[PDB]
Amino acid sequence: CXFXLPGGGGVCXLXSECIX
């Protein structure tokens, strides 16, 4: 974190469908 536009295994929600 901070999340939002990350890079690893998961995405911030999904990339807009959650936060984004």
Would you say 1 and 7 are in contact if contact means Cβ atoms under 8 Å apart? no
**What CA–CA distance (Å, rounded) separates 5 from 16?**
10
Q: How was this structure determined?
A: NMR
Structural contact between residues 14 and 8, judged by C-beta atoms closer than 8 angstroms: no
The count of other CB atoms within 10 Å of the CB of residue 11 is 16
Rounded Cα–Cα distance for residues 7 and 18 (Å): 16
- Please answer whether residues 13 and 19 qualify as being in contact, where contact means their C-beta atoms are separated by less than 8 angstroms: yes
**Alpha carbons 12 and 18: distance in angstroms, whole number:** 7
Q: Which two tokens stand for residue 16?
A: 């807009």
CA distance 13 to 16: 7
Contact 3, 16 (CB under 8 A): no
Encoding tokens for residue 3?
A: 């999340």
Listed in sequence order, the residues at least 6 apart from 11 whose beta carbon sits closer than 8 Å to its beta carbon are none
